[PDB]
Amino acid sequence: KYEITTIHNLFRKLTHRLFRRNFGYTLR
Numbered sequence: 001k002y003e004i005t006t007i008h009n010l011f012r013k014l015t016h017r018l019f020r021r022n023f024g025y026t027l028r
Helices: 020-027
Strands: none
Touching: none
16 A cells, blocks of 8 residues: 555656655555
């Protein structure tokens, strides 16, 4: 439910500036 979304480059965004706001949905 967490790392399941991140495989290789999917959620491996080196610059999580816009995804950081979305991560809140996966972390919580």
